[PDB]
Design a protein around this motif. Structure first.
Motif, PDB file in Angstrom:
ATOM      1  N   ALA D  59    -149.199  20.019  26.711  1.00 59.76           N
ATOM      2  CA  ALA D  59    -149.511  18.692  26.230  1.00 59.76           C
ATOM      3  C   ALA D  59    -149.230  17.657  27.304  1.00 59.76           C
ATOM      4  CB  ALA D  59    -148.781  18.446  24.962  1.00 59.76           C
ATOM      5  N   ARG D  60    -150.280  16.997  27.817  1.00 58.25           N
ATOM      6  CA  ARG D  60    -150.176  15.933  28.809  1.00 58.25           C
ATOM      7  C   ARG D  60    -150.065  14.564  28.126  1.00 58.25           C
ATOM      8  NH1 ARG D  60    -154.714  12.770  31.421  1.00 58.25           N
ATOM      9  NH2 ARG D  60    -153.776  11.781  33.280  1.00 58.25           N
ATOM     10  N   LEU D  61    -149.103  13.747  28.549  1.00 57.87           N
ATOM     11  CA  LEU D  61    -148.916  12.398  28.050  1.00 57.87           C
ATOM     12  C   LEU D  61    -149.188  11.439  29.193  1.00 57.87           C
ATOM     13  CD1 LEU D  61    -146.981  14.244  26.005  1.00 57.87           C
ATOM     14  CD2 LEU D  61    -146.047  12.055  25.593  1.00 57.87           C
ATOM     15  N   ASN D  62    -150.143  10.517  28.988  1.00 58.12           N
ATOM     16  CA  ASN D  62    -150.585   9.593  30.024  1.00 58.12           C
ATOM     17  C   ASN D  62    -149.833   8.270  29.904  1.00 58.12           C
ATOM     18  OD1 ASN D  62    -151.921   8.117  31.971  1.00 58.12           O
ATOM     19  ND2 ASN D  62    -153.944   8.396  31.030  1.00 58.12           N
ATOM     20  N   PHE D  63    -148.947   7.971  30.856  1.00 58.32           N
ATOM     21  CA  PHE D  63    -148.090   6.794  30.815  1.00 58.32           C
ATOM     22  C   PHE D  63    -148.809   5.585  31.434  1.00 58.32           C
ATOM     23  CE2 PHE D  63    -143.821   7.642  28.973  1.00 58.32           C
ATOM     24  CZ  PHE D  63    -144.023   8.914  28.522  1.00 58.32           C
ATOM     25  N   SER D  64    -150.123   5.667  31.662  1.00 58.89           N
ATOM     26  CA  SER D  64    -150.943   4.498  31.987  1.00 58.89           C
ATOM     27  C   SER D  64    -150.996   3.511  30.830  1.00 58.89           C
ATOM     28  CB  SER D  64    -152.298   4.918  32.468  1.00 58.89           C
ATOM     29  OG  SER D  64    -152.123   5.564  33.725  1.00 58.89           O
ATOM     30  N   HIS D  65    -150.875   4.021  29.598  1.00 60.88           N
ATOM     31  CA  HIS D  65    -150.953   3.278  28.359  1.00 60.88           C
ATOM     32  C   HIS D  65    -149.890   3.847  27.427  1.00 60.88           C
ATOM     33  CE1 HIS D  65    -154.934   2.296  29.932  1.00 60.88           C
ATOM     34  NE2 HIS D  65    -155.218   3.597  29.908  1.00 60.88           N
ATOM     35  N   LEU D  99    -145.532  14.775  31.684  1.00 58.40           N
ATOM     36  CA  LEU D  99    -145.564  13.338  31.764  1.00 58.40           C
ATOM     37  C   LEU D  99    -146.413  12.976  32.964  1.00 58.40           C
ATOM     38  CD1 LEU D  99    -142.649  10.916  31.438  1.00 58.40           C
ATOM     39  CD2 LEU D  99    -144.205  10.710  33.417  1.00 58.40           C
ATOM     40  N   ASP D 100    -147.490  12.202  32.754  1.00 59.43           N
ATOM     41  CA  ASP D 100    -148.360  11.768  33.845  1.00 59.43           C
ATOM     42  C   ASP D 100    -148.081  10.297  34.144  1.00 59.43           C
ATOM     43  OD1 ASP D 100    -150.771  10.785  35.276  1.00 59.43           O
ATOM     44  OD2 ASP D 100    -151.604  12.787  34.941  1.00 59.43           O
ATOM     45  N   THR D 101    -147.607   9.951  35.337  1.00 60.98           N
ATOM     46  CA  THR D 101    -147.204   8.564  35.608  1.00 60.98           C
ATOM     47  C   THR D 101    -148.437   7.640  35.735  1.00 60.98           C
ATOM     48  OG1 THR D 101    -147.311   9.053  37.766  1.00 60.98           O
ATOM     49  CG2 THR D 101    -145.114   9.354  36.801  1.00 60.98           C
ATOM     50  N   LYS D 102    -148.260   6.350  35.465  1.00 64.36           N
ATOM     51  CA  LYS D 102    -149.193   5.281  35.790  1.00 64.36           C
ATOM     52  C   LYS D 102    -149.349   5.169  37.300  1.00 64.36           C
ATOM     53  CE  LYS D 102    -150.130   0.371  34.944  1.00 64.36           C
ATOM     54  NZ  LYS D 102    -149.214  -0.748  35.112  1.00 64.36           N
ATOM     55  N   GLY D 103    -148.232   5.021  38.014  1.00 65.03           N
ATOM     56  CA  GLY D 103    -148.276   4.962  39.465  1.00 65.03           C
ATOM     57  C   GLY D 103    -148.545   3.542  39.929  1.00 65.03           C
ATOM     58  N   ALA D 223    -147.292  13.268  39.217  1.00 63.55           N
ATOM     59  CA  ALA D 223    -146.957  12.019  39.881  1.00 63.55           C
ATOM     60  C   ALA D 223    -148.209  11.447  40.517  1.00 63.55           C
ATOM     61  CB  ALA D 223    -145.901  12.258  40.932  1.00 63.55           C
ATOM     62  N   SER D 224    -148.557  10.183  40.207  1.00 71.35           N
ATOM     63  CA  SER D 224    -149.821   9.596  40.626  1.00 71.35           C
ATOM     64  C   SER D 224    -149.802   9.166  42.077  1.00 71.35           C
ATOM     65  CB  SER D 224    -150.180   8.423  39.754  1.00 71.35           C
ATOM     66  OG  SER D 224    -150.409   8.876  38.418  1.00 71.35           O
ATOM     67  N   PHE D 225    -150.993   9.198  42.696  1.00 74.66           N
ATOM     68  CA  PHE D 225    -151.246   8.559  43.987  1.00 74.66           C
ATOM     69  C   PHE D 225    -150.232   8.979  45.059  1.00 74.66           C
ATOM     70  CE2 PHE D 225    -151.888   4.405  46.433  1.00 74.66           C
ATOM     71  CZ  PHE D 225    -153.238   4.600  46.703  1.00 74.66           C
ATOM     72  N   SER D 250    -147.915  17.000  42.362  1.00 75.89           N
ATOM     73  CA  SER D 250    -148.451  15.844  43.044  1.00 75.89           C
ATOM     74  C   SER D 250    -149.981  15.650  42.750  1.00 75.89           C
ATOM     75  CB  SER D 250    -148.201  15.934  44.485  1.00 75.89           C
ATOM     76  OG  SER D 250    -146.827  15.879  44.784  1.00 75.89           O
ATOM     77  N   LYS D 251    -150.370  14.436  42.359  1.00 80.13           N
ATOM     78  CA  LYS D 251    -151.753  14.096  42.135  1.00 80.13           C
ATOM     79  C   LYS D 251    -152.372  13.618  43.444  1.00 80.13           C
ATOM     80  CE  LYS D 251    -152.657  11.912  38.107  1.00 80.13           C
ATOM     81  NZ  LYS D 251    -152.455  10.629  37.429  1.00 80.13           N
ATOM     82  N   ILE D 252    -153.353  14.374  43.959  1.00 84.06           N
ATOM     83  CA  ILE D 252    -154.036  13.992  45.168  1.00 84.06           C
ATOM     84  C   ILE D 252    -155.285  13.213  44.710  1.00 84.06           C
ATOM     85  CG2 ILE D 252    -155.038  14.829  47.298  1.00 84.06           C
ATOM     86  CD1 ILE D 252    -152.102  15.540  47.210  1.00 84.06           C
TER      87      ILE D 252
HETATM   88  K   LIG Z   1    -151.802   8.233  34.555  1.00 79.59           K
END
Ligand SMILES: [K+]
Ligand SMILES: [Mg+2]
Lengths: 505, 502, 517, 513
Positions: D59-65, D99-103, D223-225, D250-252
């Motif tokens: 389960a991925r949670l998007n911390f952009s929102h 946990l997917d960061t906003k970045g 981790a974003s960007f 790491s998100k490339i």
């Molecule tokens: K994100």
């Protein structure tokens, strides 16, 4: 920079050849078995002891000459010499005994008439020649060749009679008496075993020989006749079929499947077929044996000059190396050891060359191909064995240690041609002797009693292999080795692989 | 069912070996050059004629022995025998001449001195002065010294002002003024001896095709040979003989400087342990194949045929495996010079070479040679590889190459086609020297240069076609590959044609 | 550092993937043909001109809709746009026309313009009795395929409306099937029917297709994409319908059901090429299996040296959006890597908002993907899988591809009358573009079916001297390559010609520097 | 004829492709992990239960929102749904939480305006233009933009819709020419293609979110960007001691991350090929290149790689994917991806369940279609030789699994490492990784072919019996899940001693009754 490991890493065969390095010394283990013909130069207990120390693994006895009494004495001397090292089982090397059958024979620009009428047995002349093979006319046609005296003379049949052939001489020379005859390309119907062979085989069973080299094998039914003569009592004796004529080469597949292994009998083979084609037959037989996982012996005239000289010719050095590179389980000496000067030097030279050539094998391609060519099977031992060879390449292991009763588990490791020596620990003395037929198996005979607890009895035999390898200089403390055992009493079979450091103690 | 073509189609080397077939007969063409040492058994015009018919391609002259007068007579006889077939240029075989230079108790103690003791030659007096003045400077604690073609062996124990004291490792009966070898040493002797300078000058005068230069240990040795040959001898190919440790170790610099290599197994197997010769042989043949430069496998290939009409099985094997390794040429050294059965030895090399050429695994060799070759802008390189590829695809009876210098044909041969390379030249030296390269069958066109360039090309192509028919390489309706240029001179080979034989 | 030449040198496929470099720009040439379906977004002369400039090679006409007069006008507009560049033969790009047949169909009846709801596991009887033609409801459905009962068994599925509905036959009658609905939804009128796994005995060509094929012959089309090819005898019926008059028209078989996949080999042998028709194929077979069928067809076509087209939904979202999805970028790249000779656009060019942008994107991606091919392994495998032959042209062609890899040649220039010589080069998949010089305008158009062939139409008269006429055509290819920016002066090219005027004598390869004009 | 096994035996890749068979059905096991973004369509306990049954592994949670409170509730629901299967440990499927960061972001100021190809647009860094963005003058929040761009550089606004080329460079301004026009809104995202962006590795918001992830016991961070190794290290230090066992993926997502991929991979536990932002940063036609390069290098280093974004995009609205989408999923698997991802498709779309199911179906087909013969040869040739016994055992076990067509490779593992070592050689047979560590079990979903199973039995006093218990558990799992039956051969990996680091024992065993 040791063991041709720079060459081992090459991406191509060509670059592999290019990186072969005379300044990259080999490892101490020598994997290719050395078979020595015993005769007047090599029968004494004292000579046989040095012979073993120089690297003999198998004593071959040629039953073409010598009485039962003579050969019984040779076997006794082999066993005396062999058993003189038995007090230190760490250092004891098993030594096999092999019986080589005499096998069936034919014996005894101008026109030259062959006859079958027995009145000419006593008057062989330059116009009319008598031979002993009564069915010769059924197996030869107009255009057939007949070779006399190890291929010195050559005749071509021109007309076919009831009791006679009229031939034209192609290659001249001096015809003597009781000379050997060969029939290139014929389906020769001589029996699989002569009257003499039946007696010799029965004698081999009585003397507890480990293997038979059966002569002039032409078809599967020949191997079966040898097996039946060996009978129930000799069922554990390995039959190595000697391929020595056209028909044997052509029917190789059926002979291999029926045999326990093969001898490329280059002597008679090179009389029967053109000498320029022998290397073709050699390479095809070694390849198909490696593909079937059956032992294959390269024999005859490797180091021939060392009958008279203390050093081989450059062709002979090359021949030994290339037999090993081809994939031969077993180089042989035939008179270099039997009747020559320098028997010990010939053994030592085979040892030296074999070891160099074992390092020069392109394992990277050989292993890939042996894996791709091997049938899938649900057999656990097969899977364990290939898994173990893979693991041995991945960690450059000093050895693969195999506990085996019948030898089979070790044989299965050897067919995948690891670089690492395979230490096969057995309590079965016959297993230990016979294991010499297989590339890379170093057999060792455990004489300790069976411990009550199964786990301890396994560890005992593993520690024995560890002591053997340290003492022989295959590995030292801290090196990684591979250990193959069963998991559970005598039930099941070899299915357990352990990757272990060699212990201080 | 012919030329091991079932084996040729195998997907693995193992299956390739498994399909090798004694009942798959080879083609008539034989690609590996045969070099024969000429001597008392083989110098007569009459014997040399049969020698050529039996398959000799290069006459080797050994300047270890024999005067200039003796060798000049051998050369004359070679040319007489060779030119006796010149009346039918279809069947004329070029024969090269090669000059081989020569520029050098079991535990008991022996002192080697340099102070002159040529008057005495005993075990008590110990090992003679020898000729090598600098020996003390090139040997250390541990060093070995081998005397009389490696029969005796000494290990140096102490090092003095004028002398070194040894313990013998391998005992025997010591003769006088015999050969000495220094395993692992950096030998300081000159690249070419005073005698070799005279012999090389003589080779230039006698129009030899190539020199086999002895005891090459480093690039600067090859350069000294080249400079001695000078401007006059600039087209003479130098084959460096690798015969000791240092030559093996410095092989790369020697190869770069040389026109080719001789794996001189005789002295090499005295210098290095005999069990390692096959290593050095395979490494040198591989690196030569990789650089596209000729390599000769030499010395005891059919040794027993000095006395006997048939070889040993190890000898049969050795010849086959040299060819399989990739050797451009095989050599006979006394099998032809002084033995009985000189003709039978030549014939046997021919027979074995042909069998072994069919048993090469071209599928893998060609892949590897293609991958290991650098990319280049060179059109002739692209044409040559294109032509080899095409020759595999249509099982062509030959690759026909028009060449002035030989180079275009050399570039084809380095990619190791199955098909014989018929190299048509008007340059007689080119035709002789082409025998150094696996698969080049040189033919010497003696027709005048036609006025029209296109006609002159077609003339030479049809000559090659007649040669191939007459020698039984191909017949009418088989396909062949033809390489020519767009323009009169050397270095413009850029055009490949696939043509049926008329 | 360009054309993924670092990746080209890898010894392993894995290392090849590892060295793929976004900062290694491709060369100018794009080898994969782009086939564009023409419709309301793309039929005007003006839009077709830009369409060509953007990279369209083949105009596809879909005979599922539209009258003969409508399509005749599209063909005319394609020709107008194409021939507007003909004043500069150096820069003239041939454009093929393709006729895509409607093909046989199974259709539902009616019931004006209403729908009904099929639910869960409710009973639904299919009938062949024509009293229910206009009386279809949620209890009874009428179909036009009279033999349906002979080709389906108990357990068979029936899919209705491009696979929206799904039925399973439970009892089998004389003139009826009683089915259970598996997947419900809204059933309208005159909806399409698919029979997964069935040996459908509908004719190879419909009554409408006979008309359409006759029309294609009359309009001089270059190729037919024949729908719903199930067996070799279907291809032969198409060929026979085309007859003598249409014998030079290439037949591209559309594989779009189970039976066509299973009988692929006989279909290929009989066809000039293949379309992987993923739309209907993905209705017929599970969608998760389409990539299997795609890769199997592309491989076997590459192995036979016959053209293969990858089609349908490649850039689907670009019907509405000016940029594709990441999956669509991937699909295009992977079709090219698989080995497809041509890629296709359907709605994206026919009726979408962004027809030119879709063409341009295919161009961009194709070119990147062509550089990412592992030529080292592809070429080895193509060579090993090819039969030996005594045919000179085959040997010349493979020799030429080998030479083109050896010198990194800017092009392989092929003189060809029929196209065959160029086709033989293309099957060995050179990286270098194949400039195929022909005087035959049909050859030039049809050559777009083959990966890497850049066809050029020589309009100069046949010179009296044969040698000069050869040189003229070679110099034309040289000028084309310079003008299109494939190579410049001093670069090395490969030139294939014959020894003799007539076709089937290509046997000569020259490796030549590009001269000063 | 059953698992693309005819194609498996081919001597060439071309013949392999040619033998791919729609009528050769796959086996039950599906090796590629499926990561589902959770959102309004998929947060309920009841939907998450079906989501798991359909094949969600992470389960991925998007911390952009979304706030902390919102995401805490999502995690709780994930755990409730996951633990509803806990009573039968034979059948229980671990489900990881990611946990997917906003970045960091660069964002415009403050209603839209029209920009025209050819026209001037001056970007400014003076904050007086925060509320006064027009067609002539634009606000950004990245103060160092001028230092990281030159004359010739591009600037992209609103997910790459607008495109500007800088023409003059100032102190606190840039004057640009519009290349691609459009409607410019407010608060829009900016991308700087090819620039070395000096924004921090983690934003103020990300530090808080990562600390929240530690608090919530998440298994991994996307981790974003990520642009360089030092970015991964800053994430690790923010996770700190308490989060040291949390995997950092790491998100490339831009040029610099692709160019510095090697240093990023070395520092990371794995990689996400973030095709979304990546295809905004780089030309979309080059995304496949970046994807293939990253998947290869991850496979070569033995670290997990996730293929993300737009894989089944059309399934946001439709119950079936496009043919391009089917293709994309299959090809990501064939490329070598450990995991595949769903974003909108599971977060906010119709058909969230159907999207999961489709990934499952395609992954399984494509796993059968892998050319193991070549992949295994290459992976073993490219792997460094080593004295490490576990490495030798692991490769030995994969080799054995090919030789006997084993139904599984059973691995006892505490940390996961021994199973990870097996997975990098890409066996066909599924890897049943038996652990008592629930974190290990969740994280193992990052690795192609690991089926993690959570042993809840008490530690037996005798060590050998406790080993055999766990092996029997794996055997029961495999039987129950239909990987193998009685009499089939399997591979069993254990060690010589308790604790991690001692795996050295490989057994080839028939499955008992
Ligand atoms: K994100
Ligand atoms: Mg369709």
């Amino acid at each position: 920079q040791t063991q041709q490991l720079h060459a081992a890493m090459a991406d191509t065969f060509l670059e592999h050849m290019c990186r072969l390095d005379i300044d990259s010394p080999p490892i101490t283990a020598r994997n290719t078995g050395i078979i020595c013909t015993i005769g007047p130069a090599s029968r004494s207990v004292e000579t046989l002891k040095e012979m073993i120390k120089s690297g003999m693994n198998v004593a071959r006895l040629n039953f073409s000459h010598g009485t039962h009494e003579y050969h019984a004495e040779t076997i006794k001397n082999v066993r005396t010499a062999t058993e003189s090292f038995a007090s230190d089982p760490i250092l004891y090397r098993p030594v096999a005994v092999a019986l080589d059958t005499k096998g069936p024979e034919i014996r005894t620009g101008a026109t030259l008439k062959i006859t079958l009428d027995n009145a000419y047995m006593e008057k062989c002349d330059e116009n009319i020649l008598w031979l002993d093979y009564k069915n010769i006319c059924k197996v030869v046609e107009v255009g057939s060749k007949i070779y006399v005296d190890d291929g010195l003379i050559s005749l071509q049949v021109k007309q076919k009679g009831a009791d006679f052939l009229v031939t034209e001489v192609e290659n001249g020379g001096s015809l003597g008496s009781k000379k050997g005859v060969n029939l290139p390309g014929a389906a020769v119907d001589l029996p699989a075993v002569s009257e003499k062979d039946i007696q010799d085989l029965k004698f081999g069973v009585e003397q507890d020989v480990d293997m038979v080299f059966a002569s002039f094998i032409r078809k599967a039914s020949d191997v079966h006749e040898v097996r039946k003569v060996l009978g129930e009592k000799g069922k554990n004796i390995k039959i190595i079929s000697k391929i020595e004529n056209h028909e044997g080469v052509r029917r190789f597949d059926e002979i291999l499947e029926a045999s326990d292994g093969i001898m490329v009998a280059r002597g008679d083979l090179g009389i029967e077929i053109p000498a320029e084609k022998v290397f073709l037959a050699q390479k095809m037989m070694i390849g198909r044996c490696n593909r079937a996982g059956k032992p294959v012996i390269c024999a005859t005239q490797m180091l021939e000059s060392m009958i008279k000289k203390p050093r081989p010719t450059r062709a002979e050095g090359s021949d030994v190396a290339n037999a090993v590179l081809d994939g031969a389980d077993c180089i042989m000496l035939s008179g270099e050891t039997a009747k020559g000067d320098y028997p010990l030097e010939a053994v030592r030279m085979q040892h030296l060359i074999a070891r160099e050539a074992e390092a020069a094998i392109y394992h990277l391609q050989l292993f890939e191909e042996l894996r791709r060519l091997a049938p899938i099977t649900s057999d656990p031992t097969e899977a364990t064995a290939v898994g173990a060879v893979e693991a041995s390449f991945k960690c450059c292991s000093g050895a693969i240690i195999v506990l085996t009763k019948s030898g089979r588990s070790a044989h299965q490791v050897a067919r995948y041609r690891p670089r690492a020596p395979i230490i096969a620990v057995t309590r079965n003395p016959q297993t230990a002797r016979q294991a010499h037929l297989y590339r890379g198996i170093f057999p060792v005979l455990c004489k300790d009693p069976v411990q009550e607890a199964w786990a301890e009895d396994v560890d005992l035999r593993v520690n024995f292999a560890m002591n053997v390898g340290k003492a022989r200089g295959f590995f030292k403390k801290g090196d990684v080795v591979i250990v193959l055992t069963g998991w559970r009493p005598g039930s099941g079979f070899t299915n357990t692989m352990r990757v272990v450091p060699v212990p201080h103690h």
